[PDB]
Each structure stands twice: as C-alpha cells, then as structure tokens.
Amino acid sequence: LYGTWRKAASLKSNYNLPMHKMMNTDLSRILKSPEIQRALRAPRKKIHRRVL
Amino acid sequence: PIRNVYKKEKARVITEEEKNFKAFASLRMARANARLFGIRAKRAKEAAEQD
Amino acid sequence: APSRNGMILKPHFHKDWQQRVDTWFNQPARKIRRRKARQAKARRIAPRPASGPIRPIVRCPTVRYHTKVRAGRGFSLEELRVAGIHKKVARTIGISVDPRRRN
Amino acid sequence: PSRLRKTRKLRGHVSHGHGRIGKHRKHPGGRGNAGGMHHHRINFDKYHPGYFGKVGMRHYHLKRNQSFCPTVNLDKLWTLVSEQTRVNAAKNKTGVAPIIDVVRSGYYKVLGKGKLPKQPVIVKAKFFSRRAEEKIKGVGGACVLVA
Amino acid sequence: AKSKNHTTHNQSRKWHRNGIKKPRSQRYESLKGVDPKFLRNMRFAKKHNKKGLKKMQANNAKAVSARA
Amino acid sequence: DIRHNKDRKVRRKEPKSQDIYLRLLVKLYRFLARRTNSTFNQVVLKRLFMSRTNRPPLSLSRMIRKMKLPGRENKTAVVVGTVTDDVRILEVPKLKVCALRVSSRARSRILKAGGKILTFDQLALESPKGRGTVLLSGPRKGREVYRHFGKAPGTPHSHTKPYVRSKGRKFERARGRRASRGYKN
RNA sequence: GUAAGAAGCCCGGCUCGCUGGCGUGGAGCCGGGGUGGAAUGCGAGUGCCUAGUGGGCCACUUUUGGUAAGCAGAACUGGC
RNA sequence: UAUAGGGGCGAAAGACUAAUCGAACCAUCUAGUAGCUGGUUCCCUCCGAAGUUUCCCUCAGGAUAGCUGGCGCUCUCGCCC
RNA sequence: CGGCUACCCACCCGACCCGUCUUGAAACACGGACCAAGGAGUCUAACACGUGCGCGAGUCGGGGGCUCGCACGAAAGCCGCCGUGGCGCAAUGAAGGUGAAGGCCGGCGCGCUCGCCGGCCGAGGUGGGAUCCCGAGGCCUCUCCAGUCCGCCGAGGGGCACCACCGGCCCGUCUCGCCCGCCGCGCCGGGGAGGUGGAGCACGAGCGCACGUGUUAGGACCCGAAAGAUGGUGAACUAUG
RNA sequence: AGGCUAAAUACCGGCACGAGACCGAUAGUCAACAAGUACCGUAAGGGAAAGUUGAAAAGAACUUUGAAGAGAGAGUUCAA
Ligand SMILES: [Mg+2]
Ligand SMILES: [Mg+2]
Ligand SMILES: [Mg+2]
Ligand SMILES: [Mg+2]
Ligand SMILES: [Mg+2]
Ligand SMILES: [Mg+2]
Ligand SMILES: [Mg+2]
Ligand SMILES: [Mg+2]
Ligand SMILES: [Mg+2]
Ligand SMILES: [Mg+2]
Ligand SMILES: [Mg+2]
Ligand SMILES: [Mg+2]
Ligand SMILES: [Mg+2]
Ligand SMILES: [Mg+2]
Ligand SMILES: [Mg+2]
Ligand SMILES: [Mg+2]
Ligand SMILES: [Mg+2]
Ligand SMILES: [Mg+2]
Ligand SMILES: [Mg+2]
Ligand SMILES: [Mg+2]
Ligand SMILES: [Mg+2]
Ligand SMILES: [Mg+2]
Ligand SMILES: [Mg+2]
Ligand SMILES: [Mg+2]
Ligand SMILES: [Mg+2]
Ligand SMILES: [Mg+2]
Ligand SMILES: [Mg+2]
Ligand SMILES: [Mg+2]
Ligand SMILES: [Mg+2]
Ligand SMILES: [Mg+2]
Ligand SMILES: [Mg+2]
Ligand SMILES: [Mg+2]
Ligand SMILES: [Mg+2]
Ligand SMILES: [Mg+2]
Ligand SMILES: [Mg+2]
Ligand SMILES: [Mg+2]
C-alpha cells in the first residue's frame, strides 16, 4: 500500500515513501566517534570569573 | 470508452531531399500567397483588360 | 486609499451581494442523493448497463481541441443506414441516435 | 487565530494602534480608486504608468481558441519522448532517425534553443521558427509540416 | 485660518539621523552620455581585439618570459 | 552618550522551523563550528538557520557547470538546501554530491551515473573540518519577487515590472509608457 | 566643493570602422616586477515590508512688516 | 358630509392639517454618508518620531518624499599590517 | 518572642482630578453621583511581502466519480487513459506576426569594416567576492633514517551567491547598402551592419496549504445627522365649503 | 412568426425528523413563563418586564402577646 524506498506503492499510483533526512539520528555516537574527535579543539573548561 | 489511440510511425530513414524539403520560408510564402491571392487575380484581370 | 506599492484592485462587491450567497453546505448530501439515485436506477434497470445508450466517436470542433477525440450524443442517420438497422428500433435496442448531426 | 492576532496585544491602548491626532475615519481619502487623476496622481503615475487611456484597436468577440499556440523549445524537444529513444539513436546502427511529434505532447510551434545533441531527428509540427529550423538542419535533422 | 507657511527647522537632524553619506563609488561607473561615435569606436576596438591579440601578444609573452 | 538604535544585531541565531531533523543537524553543526574552528563549519551552520527564501533550490545543470571548473575533480559539492533535477541536460558526470532533501527525479539521474550521494550527518562523519569541499548555492535573486523591486516603475529607467492584474493590451500601457499618450516614462 | 593611493604610478605589446603629415593623438585589452602614504575615532554594505506624522511652540544670535505686543513671518543650533 | 402630504385648506400670520407644519404620521430602502465630535478593555521588555518638500476646488483632508520599526541577508576582527 | 502585609492611628517630607482635542489642562474647557451586568478592529473575496510545511519544472482534485447501509462518517481513503482546467515553464508589437547559445583552433575566396568549411567542449570577459585547493618556512628526550606523532602560515589557483561594467541573443522602430531561394520568379519571402524602446533570454523556481502584517470592496472598530425614495393611516384638534 | 414533455437545479413559508467546537435568562428568535400577551396611539403601527423552595409540602399542629399585619416558644427536613 505504501511501498519501500526501492519500489513505489502498488495501490497508490504516483506515491513513494518519504525521504529520510538524517541517516543516523543518534548524536551521541556521532560526537563520540573517533573521526569527529580526531580534529577537535581542547576543552578549556576554565571559568575565568571576575577578578576584584 | 473513447480512450485515445495514436499512429506509431516509429522510425524511418531520412530521404535525400528532406534537408531542403521544407523551411520557415515555405510557411512564410504560404502565408504571403494566402494574403495576396485575390489581389494578384484582380491585377491579372485588369492587365488582360488592357491586353 | 492606495498604499506605497500594490496591484490596483477592482473588486465586484459594490452590489448588494450578502443577500444572495450560495454556500455549499449541502454538497455531501447532494452527492449521497446522486449516488443513491444512480444505485436505484442501476438496480431497476439491472439487465441494462449504466449509461446504456452507446455514444459515437466525436471530434472536437475548435482548433484547440481538434487533435483529441471524445464521446458524443448519438449516431447519425447515415451511420444507422450504413449499419443497416432501422432508425426507430435503435432507441429500444440501446443505441442513442442524433438526427441533427451530419457526416 | 485571534489569540495570535494583533488586536489582543492592543488592549489598554485607547487609540488601538491608530494615533490620537488623526483617528481612524471611515474612508478619509476616498472609496476605492477615487481620484486616480488628481490628489492621487503622484502615486498613480509613479506605481502604475500607462493606466489611463486606450492604446490598441478593439476586436469584437475574441476567442482564446484561435490564438491557441503553445511553444516548445529544442532543449525540451527530447523530454517529450522516452529516454530509451535517445540511447537507441545514439547507438547509431544505421542512418535512421527517431520521429518526435510535438502534436501528441500538445505543442504546435517549435522555438529555437541551443545545445542540441548530434543525433538526427524528424520533427512534425504545424509551425517552426527560423532559428530552430536552421539549428535542427545544421545537425542533420528534418522538419515535417502537419496540419 | 492662517497657518505656518514654510520652514526648514528640524530637517538637518532628520537628515543626519540616517546619514548624508556620499554615493557608492565603484569602478566602471557607466558609459551613458558618452559620445555615440566614441562608444561605437570603443565597441569596434573591443570586438576586433581578439583577432590579433591572441597571437602577437602570446608571442610577446613568450619572448618576455624567455628574457626573464 | 550613544544612541541605541543599531546596538541589537538583527541576524537570527536559532532556526524558526520545528523540524526535528533540522534541529538535530543544527545541534551537531553548532558543536562542530564551535570546536573544530572551521570557517566552513561556521558558514554551513549559518546557512541552516536561513529561511525558505534564503535557501534557493540549486538546479542540476548549474551544479554540473560549477563542478566542471578546473580543480573540482574529486571535491565534494555541498548544497545547503534542495537540489532539483534538470531536464535540459542529458548526460551527467560522476557527481559525488552532498545536499539536503534531494529530489526523487534527480536521485535516479545521479545514481545511474555511478556517483554516490550522502547526507549532512554522513558528511560530518566523513570530513568534519570540511576538507576537499565546494560550497554551492542556488540563485538567491533568481526569484520572481526580486523582479518587481527597484526604485519605482515611473522613473525613465525603471525596468521593474509593475504589478498588473492581467497582462495584455489596454493594461497599464497608455499614459506613461508611450510618447503618443502623455509622456514616455 | 575636491584631493591626501594599490580602483595609483612606472614598462612592454596588441585592437580601433574615432581623429589623422607622421607608428599622430585618444580610448580598450593583455603580460611580469615593486602597498608603510595627515591626525583622531568607529565595524560596515544592502534588500523588502511598514504604522504614526502631514495645527506646533519657545530661547542666544542674524533678521522682514509693525510705534509696540506674551503680534505676524524667516536662517543655524538647542529645548518643550 | 367633501377636499390627504409637494397635497388639502387659508378675510394671507407660509398660519392650520390629532401637543409635531418653511412640507404630518407609520414601516421599509437603512447598520443611508460624514474629510466632523466622543469612546475604543491584560502585564512586562526593546526600539522609538513628525508637524517638513511637491501635487490635488487643495487649507479640519489625502497622495508622494522624509523621520520610525520589523524581517533579514553579504562580508570584516578576533594570533613590519 | 518574630511577623511584611489588603486593620486602625501619628508625626516628617513630597504631594492640584482622572480620560482626550491641543504648542499649551488641575483649570473659570468638555464627560463622570455611586455600584453590578453588556460594550467596540470581527468575517468574506482579492492583492503585496515575510515565515513554516510537502512536491519540484512541475504543482494543485477544492469539481465530479468509486468502495458497504452506518453513532463518531457533512470525516477519512482512492481515481491514473478523470489534469478538462488554474499558476509557472517566453517574451515583444495596436495588429497582421515574429519569437532568445556562446568560446577555441586551422584553411580558402583580395582571413577584405570579409562569408563558409572541419574538430571540441558547450551560456562570454573584467574588478571585488564566503568557502575550497596547492604551498616556501619554521613548531615534538641524547643521533643520519622514516611513515602518524606538534602544528600554524607568506605567496599562488579554480572561484557559490551577489555587486558594477563591457560584449552576446529575441521582439517593435530609424539609416545604410548587398546577398540567397522558388508548388511558381511577383509593390513574393529570408538574411546583415549600426542607434534606440520592452514588464525580455543569457542552465529555469514555481505550485498548494497555514500563519502574521499592510491596503482595499463589502454596514466593515463602535455610536451619531440636516436630507432622498417607495407604499399606506389620519378633517375626534384646527382651516374651509 | 404553432404546441407538449420527467431528469440533474432552488427552496429563510408548511408538515415531521436528526445533528451542533453556537447562546445559557441584560445572552439566544421580540417571546424558555397565561408573548405578538399586558400596555400605548383614532388608525396605519409600536411592543415589554417576568425561570429556580424543598429528595419528598413533609407549607410550620399546638400555647401565648397583639383587633390584625407581626412576633416569642414549639414542630418537619441533614439544613428554615
Ligand atoms: Mg495609511
Ligand atoms: Mg450599496
Ligand atoms: Mg503606546
Ligand atoms: Mg492617515
Ligand atoms: Mg491634522
Ligand atoms: Mg501646515
Ligand atoms: Mg531609547
Ligand atoms: Mg497601525
Ligand atoms: Mg498665531
Ligand atoms: Mg513668532
Ligand atoms: Mg417630494
Ligand atoms: Mg398641531
Ligand atoms: Mg419630502
Ligand atoms: Mg456603524
Ligand atoms: Mg495642507
Ligand atoms: Mg529605515
Ligand atoms: Mg532598524
Ligand atoms: Mg480609557
Ligand atoms: Mg479637532
Ligand atoms: Mg487654542
Ligand atoms: Mg487633562
Ligand atoms: Mg474640566
Ligand atoms: Mg462652559
Ligand atoms: Mg457634568
Ligand atoms: Mg464586563
Ligand atoms: Mg491542459
Ligand atoms: Mg444612522
Ligand atoms: Mg438629492
Ligand atoms: Mg404618497
Ligand atoms: Mg369636524
Ligand atoms: Mg417552434
Ligand atoms: Mg415552441
Ligand atoms: Mg426537475
Ligand atoms: Mg461561542
Ligand atoms: Mg426581557
Ligand atoms: Mg391569636
């Protein structure tokens, strides 16, 4: 009735399955992957508050 | 129903004189003759009148 | 009245139009009535098909649509004569006849 | 959405977003296109040139069916037929050309656009432009007139 | 009902609020108003340049590259 | 002191759309442009906030011409927005491209040539800093709305297509468009 | 009002149906070499849509009519 | 008992015509039009004017420009110039 | 014992009664005796811009039809040889009508202010232009050896969009002259080089739905006339027979 | 220059029915109730206000003050 991404629907004539935007919707694995963290910047977690 | 059918005329070899068979000048001459048909007839009539 | 920039408008609302406004709130009811009428007619005439009278092959008059072909009203008397059946019997046979059309 | 419109955030303002000096009077300037030639002439001549007057001759009982003549370009001349026709012509088994009839697609006149493929074609149409007719013959095609 | 006729008070402030900056100066301003004969000659010199440029200028470029 | 009329930057810093995939793409590319210190990441993050008008649909033949330029042999074409199919061209090169919401008609036309396409998350996984890339954008001023703009359709050098209800004869033609009736522009 | 540079200068070579004693003059194009060019301060450019306004008044100074006016009418700046 | 509304009647005051007459009353068109008065409803934050040019039977108004706000967009610094 | 406050009282200081027309309001300018309920920018059609969504040179079934009779069904689902049709994809003339591809190389005819031929990719060039690519140079335990290891950059190149200019193409005009064709050798057609007018082309972005603002026609933010027309009722008052 | 004919179409009146992202007694039809009723003008005509005891009247027997209106006790009800 709806078809897959390879073949269109048989019942509906000119209808195809909606397109998929982000192939991987898991941000955690993408941010923790070695390819991303290979060329990142230092964290620099210092606060540097106001000095009197 | 009245579903439309169409003649195929799939493919054919181009003849020799087809390169110079028709042109835009052909349609232009056809339109000019259709516009000046009667005027030429009247001119021929008044010319044969003088003879 | 006009503004900085905009298309000049000429709305045809100068007449007293609010007292004649046709709202299509009875459209589903009308469609249901038409469907029930079609079903009742088909059930009453069951041996005969819906839109019984056969319609001829009809070409469109104007040059804009003369490339396509469409249905028509009835077959011509000349076509009936070439077919060989009488004019008046075609109506009860189920053949719509158009005496005004020429060939 | 009344809850999203502007009138909700205008409660409490006496003028309702229209000013205290000049109130919202019922049609203060005029009704409709009033005074198109005076006291609106600046706007009517700056944003609508040519609005006043008559230009051309009148044609009584004009029918849009007579002047019906859609145009098709050479870059679209191959979008009418299927894709396999183009590759079968490009295979070039012999000196045979595919026939592309634009009357079936619904166009009556063919207009000229560049970048034609090197394959010969046989086009059938009611009208041809000069540029298109020369450009289809410069590649080895043929033009056929129909009615 | 006599009223005020014409004053230019509180106008320089309105002008300087947005700015009285100079017009945008750009290279190749325009060619309008120029002598039509001069424009025709310039068009001819521009359209006849590639006829002799791409050969003699190329030879001279090769020569000066061989020089330095 | 100083006036406060231009102190607030009018640019937007958050996408007005509520698309979940677009929100995730923004959350990813913001981290990338913040960490990797890549100007390409910065500009591709800025182009994701843009609206429908500021993200014009780039055609296929335009991208073909842009990739045919020297130095774009193996570089990946990146289009922030929709890339549409073009029926005016017949043959296409490999065309390894990454875009957003590729049209179905162009999907097959690109996949039959042999080139592979990928989305923004796959692009970030492949090249985080955006190396070997060519950022392309469609015609922003090619929209029809920009043809009605200018100074005024009354100045003698307008060419601004004034708004007309119906195009044809006796429609904004007589007084102000020809020297016979009144004046000529 | 203008100028205080790289949108500039020096060099070589091509095009002209412009002009012409002259390879003369003037424009356009190409090619390689050389940015530190008054002080001070500041981030700039641009597109679209657009409400309100379209009765003003006062003051230092310069001024028109009036004898004069908390009168009428102007220029810069400031204020209500 | 007769004359009924641009009609009647008037020894004439334009007086009378059901407390209304230099044009009665009743219902409808009609929620007639008004460049003219009056009013126009909750909070906080940010930006924030004009009474000026030109045109209009224009001068208690409107159009245009200017002042203003919103939506953005294109770039620039952030590591001897 | 502590307690701000929606309780009362007193002292010190400051304190004119609110709303709108106005340059000017507390005014000897207008409205308000008080309290409770009702009360004013709405809706439709069209246009312009901006935003969100879906599809994409296509887009849209709102008009009808189909499945099974249905409280929710006046919904929702489908049409596929129902896209007829609307918008956009082609513009320019009053109209007859016409109607948009450039660049490199070589040759010939006087390579002639000069056309054609053959091959190729195929929407020109200049000055800016985010981004990208290459890149001298130096930056990591005693050493000549290395691929990762630390890690930026002088200069240079192809250059998105967009900006300014030059050139190119189409349609309507004016000047100059020459060439080509014949279903028929003509006040028949076609073509060039220059100047201008177009809402044009020069790898297209629109369509449908929703929302917000602005203008307009609808009684159209609300309340308000002197008046005009249509059809009927009155001489129980009064004027006259 | 003679005529007849059902179809898809319209329906704020009439006889019945169903439904509601509507109104909830200063709202909704003028009229939720003895509403085109009371009332007004000679007439054409104009035209209202007005719902809620209690589950069940079980609407307070009886004594006393007052001529009575009314009140003090008492009584029913979960509640006078
Ligand atoms: Mg306005
Ligand atoms: Mg009306
Ligand atoms: Mg305010
Ligand atoms: Mg106004
Ligand atoms: Mg005013
Ligand atoms: Mg004034
Ligand atoms: Mg402020
Ligand atoms: Mg407003
Ligand atoms: Mg005065
Ligand atoms: Mg004064
Ligand atoms: Mg009258
Ligand atoms: Mg009286
Ligand atoms: Mg009257
Ligand atoms: Mg009203
Ligand atoms: Mg005025
Ligand atoms: Mg502004
Ligand atoms: Mg602003
Ligand atoms: Mg108030
Ligand atoms: Mg006033
Ligand atoms: Mg006053
Ligand atoms: Mg006050
Ligand atoms: Mg007062
Ligand atoms: Mg008074
Ligand atoms: Mg009072
Ligand atoms: Mg209230
Ligand atoms: Mg069609
Ligand atoms: Mg009224
Ligand atoms: Mg009148
Ligand atoms: Mg009458
Ligand atoms: Mg009597
Ligand atoms: Mg008849
Ligand atoms: Mg008849
Ligand atoms: Mg019927
Ligand atoms: Mg409601
Ligand atoms: Mg009542
Ligand atoms: Mg007793």
Tokens 């052909």 locate to: B26
The two structure tokens encoding residue C75: 């077959």
CB proximity F132–strand I (7 Å threshold):
yes
CB proximity C92–strand I (7 Å threshold):
no
Q: Which residues pair with D122 in a beta bridge?
A: D99, D142
Q: Which residue of B has its CA nearest to D111?
A: B24
- For D72, the enclosing helix (H) or strand (E) is strand D71-73
In this complex, the residue of F35, F119, F128 whose CB is nearest that of residue A23 is F119
Pairwise CA distance, residues F73 & F96, whole Å: 10
Starting at the earlier edge strand, list the strands of the sheet with F76-79. Answer: F97-99, F76-79, F133-136
Q: How do strand B11-13 and strand D96-101 relate by DSSP bridges?
A: antiparallel
Contact by Cβ (8 Å): D110, D129: yes
CA neighbor of D97 nearest in space, from D124, D120, D125:
D120
CA neighbor of D24 nearest in space, from D34, D15, D33, D13:
D15
The full DSSP string for chain C is ---SS------S--S--TTS----TTHHHHHHHHHHHHHHHHHHTTTSPTT-SB---EE-SSTTTTTSEE--S-B-HHHHHHHT--TTHHHHHTB-B-TT---
CA C59 to chain centre: 16
Pairwise CA distance, residues D131 & D112, whole Å: 5
DSSP summary character for residue F74: S
Contact by Cβ (8 Å): A31, F31: yes
**Cβ of F124 and A40 within 8 Å?**
no
Pairwise CA distance, residues F51 & F43, whole Å: 15
Q: Say if E and B touch: at least 3 Cβ pairs within 8 Å.
A: no
Pairwise CA distance, residues F47 & F40, whole Å: 10
Of residues 39 to 58 in chain C, which lie within 7 A of strand I by their beta carbon? 39
Pairwise CA distance, residues D132 & D115, whole Å: 11
**Cβ of C57 and B2 within 8 Å?**
yes
Work out whether the CA dihedral D49, D55, D56, D61 comes out positive or negative.
positive
Pairwise CA distance, residues D132 & D112, whole Å: 4
Pairwise CA distance, residues C49 & D142, whole Å: 50
Pairwise CA distance, residues D64 & D13, whole Å: 55
Contact by Cβ (8 Å): D48, F172: yes
Contact by Cβ (8 Å): F153, F176: no
Q: How was this structure determined?
A: cryo-EM
Q: Categorise residue D53: left if φ over 0, alpha if ψ from -120 to 50, beta otherwise.
A: left
Resolution (in Å) of the shown entry? 3.1
DSSP summary character for residue B39: H
DSSP summary character for residue F146: G
Q: Which residues contact F68 (CB under 8 A, 6 or more apart)?
A: F93
Pairwise CA distance, residues E11 & E9, whole Å: 5
The two structure tokens encoding residue F90: 């017949």
Pairwise CA distance, residues D37 & D81, whole Å: 55
Pairwise CA distance, residues F142 & F138, whole Å: 8
Pairwise CA distance, residues C40 & D87, whole Å: 55
In this complex, the residue of D120, D127, D133 whose CB is nearest that of residue B23 is D133
The two structure tokens encoding residue F52: 């429908």
Pairwise CA distance, residues F6 & E58, whole Å: 54
CA distance C69 to chain B (A): 7
Pairwise CA distance, residues F99 & F83, whole Å: 7
